[PDB]
Amino acid sequence: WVPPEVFDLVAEDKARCMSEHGTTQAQIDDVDKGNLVNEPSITCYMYCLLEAFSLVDDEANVDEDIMLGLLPDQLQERAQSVMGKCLPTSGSDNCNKIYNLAKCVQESAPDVWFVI
Ligand SMILES: CCCCCCCCCCCCCCCC(=O)O
Ligand SMILES: [Cl-]
Numbered sequence: 001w002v003p004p005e006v007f008d009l010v011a012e013d014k015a016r017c018m019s020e021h022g023t024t025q026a027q028i029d030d031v032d033k034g035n036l037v038n039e040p041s042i043t044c045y046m047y048c049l050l051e052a053f054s055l056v057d058d059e060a061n062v063d064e065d066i067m068l069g070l071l072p073d074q075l076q077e078r079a080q081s082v083m084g085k086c087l088p089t090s091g092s093d094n095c096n097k098i099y100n101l102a103k104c105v106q107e108s109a110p111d112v113w114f115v116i
Pocket of ligand 2: 060
């Protein structure tokens with residue numbers, strides 16, 4: 001469902017986030033396929049990229065309105081349903097909060113789940 005335009009929009013932040021955190025594309029592909037581990041090089045990548053687009057703040061609180069703003073209408077209240085379950089975020093730090101959120105969302109909605 002993700003438009004191709006999104007890929008060029010995120011390219012610059014994706015490069016920076018991967019470089020900052022030691023992330024490999026293979027780690028991203030693995031999360032993308034539903035396999036999540038609590039490794040900072042991928043969890044901090046996910047936090048990094050969300051933050052770059054104002055989807056989370058300095059304590060990994062999710063901005064639900066901006067998030068709903070970005071999704072298409074067909075997912076718009078599946079997402080509200082998933083956010084009801086999975087928010088607020090909780091964890092030992094920003095990266096771990098996003099790990100637990102990722103775990104929750106992908107379990108709650110696997111056929112829509114993805115990470116760029
Ligand atoms: C759903 C929370 C779990 C963790 C999410 C994984 C990180 C992927 C972040 C996607 C960033 C997309 C921002 C692009 C918005 C746009 O410019 O159109
Ligand atoms: Cl939250």
